[PDB]
Paper text:
The immature flavivirus particles that bud into the ER lumen display prM/E protomers in which the pr moiety binds at the domain II tip to cap the fusion loop, avoiding its insertion into the ER membrane. Maturation into infectious virions in the trans-Golgi network involves an acid-pH-driven rearrangement into smooth particles made of (prM/E)2 dimers exposing a furin site for prM cleavage into “pr” and “M”. The flavivirus particle’s life cycle includes three key steps: 1- budding into the neutral pH environment of the ER lumen; 2- transport across the trans-Golgi network (TGN), where the pH is mildly acidic and where the particles undergo a maturation step before exiting to the neutral pH extracellular environment;19,20 and 3- entry via receptor-mediated endocytosis into a target cell, where the mildly acidic endosomal pH triggers E-driven fusion of the viral envelope with the endosomal membrane. The fusogenic conformational change of E is irreversible, and the consecutive steps outlined above require a special particle maturation mechanism in order to avoid premature fusion-triggering in the acidic TGN during exocytosis.
The single-chain TBEV prMe-linker-sE protein behaved as monomer in solution but crystallized as a dimer. Its X-ray structure also showed a disordered 150-loop and a partially ordered linker extending from the E N-terminus, but with pr still bound at the sE dimer interface. In short, in both the DENV2 and the TBEV structures, the presence of the artificial linker prevented ordering of the 150-loop. The difference was that the DENV2 prMe-linker-sE structure showed a monomer, while the TBEV counterpart is a dimer.
Residue numbers in the entry:
A (entry chain A), B (entry chain A): -2 to 13, 18 to 149, 159 to 189, 192 to 367, 370 to 395
C (entry chain D), D (entry chain D): 1 to 80
The structure:
Amino acid sequence: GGGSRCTHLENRDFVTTTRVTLVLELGGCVTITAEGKPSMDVWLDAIYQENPAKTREYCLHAKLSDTKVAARCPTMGPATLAEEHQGGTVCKRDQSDRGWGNHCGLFGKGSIVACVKAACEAKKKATGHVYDANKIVYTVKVEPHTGDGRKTASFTISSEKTILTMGEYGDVSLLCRVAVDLAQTVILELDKTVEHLPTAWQVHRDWFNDLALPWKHEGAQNWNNAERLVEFGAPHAVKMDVYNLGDQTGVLLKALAGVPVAHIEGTKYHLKSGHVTCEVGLEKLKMKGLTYTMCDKTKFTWKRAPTDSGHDTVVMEVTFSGTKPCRIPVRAVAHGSPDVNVAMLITPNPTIENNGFIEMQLPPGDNIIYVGELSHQWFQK
Amino acid sequence: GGGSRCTHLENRDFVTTTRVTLVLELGGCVTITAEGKPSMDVWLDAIYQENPAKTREYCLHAKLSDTKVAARCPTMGPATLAEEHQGGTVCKRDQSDRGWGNHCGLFGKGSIVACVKAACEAKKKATGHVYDANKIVYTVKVEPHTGDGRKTASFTISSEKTILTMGEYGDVSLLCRVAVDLAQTVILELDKTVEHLPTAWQVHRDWFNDLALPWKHEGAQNWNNAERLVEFGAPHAVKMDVYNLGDQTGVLLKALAGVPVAHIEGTKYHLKSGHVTCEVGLEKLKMKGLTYTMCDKTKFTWKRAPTDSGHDTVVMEVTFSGTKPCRIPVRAVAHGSPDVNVAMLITPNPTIENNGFIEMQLPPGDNIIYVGELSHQWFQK
Amino acid sequence: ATVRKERDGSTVIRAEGKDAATQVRVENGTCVILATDMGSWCDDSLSYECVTIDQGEEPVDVDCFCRNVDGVYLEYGRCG
Amino acid sequence: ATVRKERDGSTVIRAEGKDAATQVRVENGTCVILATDMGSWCDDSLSYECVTIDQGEEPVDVDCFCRNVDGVYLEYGRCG
């Protein structure tokens, strides 16, 4: 290998002195090049919190039960049910036409009230967790970009500095700072059912807090705003039906279309987006191969011929049949100028080790790459 | 009894010559008064069709299965799956980043395709039936509005005339005509589940035909437009997940809020609204009690004293202790004028029968009602 | 259908789908059950007044009515 | 996990949740299964290419990879 992960990412930056200030975005990576120093790949691997605090939970499908209706005749005042002043109920007061044909002395509008008990169907809740800046962890990884190893530093708000040992390449120092409103960021999940849905979504707390659904805190007996999922039928003399507004999963998933899907790995809740600013100290970085002799120019073979890296750099792989380890002779000419070298190594000291990957920058136009006496025509766009 | 149903309805008209042209609305009723003829209550009882034709059915919850993903490297053309040209599948073509780390010679975007089989979950269909003007039936009922019997006439487009026999009251002729676009009116139902929902709703066919859901005709193997309930995840090198958009019941019931709930009684599908225009012939109607002597003025008792009918008429009930049957003496004076009768009978020939209900119109102001020598003060608003 | 007298003087008729369009005897009166949407007894229930109709009156806008018995209520589940 | 050779020369590894972060032997090669969302076998399945990584290359953006064996596919249900 030798740092091939960065060579694959879409968001790749090159930073080319002792310190270097970089911004590390989740899903991106940075390659640091420095004269007389090995190249380093640095990236923000994760931003997560273990066991974040739960927020309120929402009901997606109400379980409606024990519907009761009371009526009073014209002049006889309001119709009442005990369930009007109880928790876990949804009530509606209305008026019905009354007369001699339904036990009233007068013809007119009489009071009618219908109440229903409202609970949540099993496995039909939407849950949330909120982040806390004092408990977030951010993982920064460093790997030598040599082409022949990966180290991890974990940071909090309180622990901003770390020194990583890059084996034989010396030491690298990292001073990282984190940067939106974490206490206003919620990670939303739905209870699992037979259908396949994403793991979770990251939403703004104010949006999560406005969902038109019944809600409660874990452990509460009843649901608040349960009327959101109840519909009352037209009143008859003494009868008024109560209906369900149905399963809200489709409603919620439609509103979540385009919202970023987040990941949960055990007790780790991952932020979908974010960045960290680092100071990378290269003063203790040393090159490996200050003792190795030049590779025999005639013993190379193209394993993978020169190809576009996707980042306006050229990548290749060579096989070596001579004495190992050795420092690889690499150069490139502008077609028509065989004397001047126009190759700018991203892998600065390519070395064949006992059991090869070279990356270079080139000026636009017709060029010829040389890995020893192994040659290849290359046009830089 | 004696025609007390009409006295209870909110939509009540009075029509006061041999023929009479009326409009009969569903949920409404008409009282016909005619000099030297008994009063009649006429109403449109129902507009229905037995066994209407089924329309397309919609899926509310997709059952997703056998998800397969195929990928090709940059330059290697499109990724394909057999399921792309099959029925009962949902497919999405996309591009994924590829390189040496996932078996491609080049770095770049490679083609990726994901396919899923899409069926409907059991009891998760929305069905429709469409009306046909050539098969609609409309039921008109007639009942003597006497206060001491109900007859039904069924009409079609082909059979517009009928003669009903009102027992001793003679005969009544009816010539009825029907009147929106029936072939563009759909009655929508959802399959029954554990929750309580209305029986059905009456919708416009063009609205029913635009529902953004998978659809099919009964008996078809697959669903059309099944992609409406599928969501594809972000593509990785060779893997792309496929998710469900969830149960659409809540989506559909939200759109049906305020839409009129319709009724199904066996094989009868009832229209929620509609009217019929009738010609009612009264030429063969005769009064009953042309032989009965006057009731004894002193043998009445208020069973229910004068009360507002709700239709700017006065209703009451009397008990009689003398010789039966007899014609009830009824009158009313404007307070200050004991000579002049200001009572306008809606029950024109009130009769006490062997095992009583009187309805009158009155001019505004202070009045006194007399049922024999039984009296009652009445202020007309 | 089953009948039970509550401690508040009320009477509760518990009905199922079989009881549709039947007439039952409650104390020294009778009640007519005309509800069309009844099923087997459960939590998904509806409970309301089974209105007493005075002698010589026709019932209006009710699918449960009584004669010669006061304070009657109907309850039914909608399962099955 | 179970292995089966199809008539088209392909190989199908059928895995469950127990198979997460395991290495299996397929013909004269080995495959590493790293899918984290696996469950018991059913209709609610996912099937894709378990990509062969060339010698001296590190796998990138794959949760199933093989060495010294060609045309391998992974399939898993997501029930339980």
